[PDB]
Subunit: 191 residues, 3 copies
């Protein structure tokens, strides 16, 4: 004979001894959001990972403006950036930033960095936006810190309206133009 | 007949052919910390997510002080903030900050942002604390960056002492009061 | 009789009714990257967590230089730092920083903080590096914010070359030496 009860746990696994009497069915195992069940003949492997993630390198040779105009923030067009790494189809680069797909509402860990050695004065202004809410931070320059960083953990509500479900990005120096810059933008959905 | 051996893997799944001889039991499948096993009749679905997370919007209309006093940091009372999103019961808002429950020791990804357009001068002082350790960062203002941000990935040891197992929060401008501000505080336990 | 079909899902679980005819084998369940299948007799528990993580406290009594020289960044030797918390063997402290092991390429959530109360002037310069890419940020001081923070979410490509697969760290004040400092460095691989 077969089957056992436990208390905690679920699906019995081989439940469904009922719906086709005389027949013990034994349910299969699927991996939902953030999981992978790989079928190695010997046993099924439950592996975890994030649903979506996109990491871009943005320079004047990977979709960037020849010169980031001094003291001013114009949202970046990242349709041409360079995809260093990505996971899933939830996060995609577009001309307005990184677009989030339908049903992708959740928490996102975002980081945008910059490095433009030739400009070590003034402050580096950074800005990530999403919907009505926009996040900022100014980073004082110097030859030792000729750049800036803005990391964020935010909740993104995805309406399902393609042009509002987008993370827009932007940065610059308040007293000089950037045309020798290396930018990095990484977005990851953790839940 | 039934059952097979594998090498790697575990529980045999239908192990426990021993403890009730003549009876093949076949163990069930439970989802521990950060997992969800949903019972779709056809098969059990293993889904992943974080254990706990809390995301607050904090303004002068969601539990905030009518005016954040200039140059000075007084821990925020977030009992009245607004819960934009939350996951689990581990992270709860209180009058001293975000409280962590018993047995919730682990790594936390924290982000507190501010935006107060009407004040574009001086620096924005931000501060997150936990126990003896406190983390800070000053953010130079400007009309383009009229705010500040502080993101953190820290290890929180939860003693189980309700008044010490709390993330306290605080920010301000070093040269003006904030009374037209929008604050956001998100905490997430990733392990 | 036994077994059932589902559509979605996998491994049938008790598949392999073929490879040893007349014998229903019933595969086992293993936990891959970021998962733990614990064998409680009653049922197997699928638990999730991160693969690797390391959290260090760095002071002049846990492998640190008696004095962090003013205005200048020298990569920190963290072989002697203090391991507040760690998860897995992927992230290990060394004399050049935190080393990543073979096959550990992936996204990393990094945070380095500093606090040196006795020095409240000038800016705190912070710097995390990895390969050719280096990330920076300057944090204006003050008695209220006598420190700095740099949080990052980056993609680390691990070549498998032990001396290049290392996160180097470094910080200081641009106008004074730090010899009463408390530093914290936490690295976590989330995918």
């Amino acid at each position: 004979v077969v089957v056992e009860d436990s208390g905690a746990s679920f699906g019995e696994s081989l439940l469904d001894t009922t719906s086709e009497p005389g027949k013990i069915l034994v349910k299969r195992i699927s991996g939902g959001s953030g999981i992978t069940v790989t079928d190695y003949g010997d046993q099924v492997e439950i592996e975890a990972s994030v649903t979506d993630a996109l990491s871009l390198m943005y320079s004047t040779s990977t979709g960037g403006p020849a010169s980031i105009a001094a003291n001013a923030l114009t949202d970046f067009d990242l349709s041409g950036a360079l995809t260093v790494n990505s996971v899933g189809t939830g996060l995609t680069k577009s001309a307005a930033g990184i677009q989030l797909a339908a049903g992708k509402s959740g928490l996102y860990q975002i980081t945008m960095t910059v490095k433009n050695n030739t400009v070590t004065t003034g402050n580096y202004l950074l800005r990530v936006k999403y919907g009505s809410s926009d996040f900022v931070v100014a980073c004082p320059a110097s030859s030792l810190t000729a750049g800036g960083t803005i990391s964020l953990l935010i909740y993104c509500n995805v309406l399902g309206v393609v042009s509002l479900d987008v993370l827009k990005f932007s940065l610059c120096n308040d007293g000089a133009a950037l045309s020798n810059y290396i930018i990095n933008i990484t977005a990851a959905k953790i839940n």
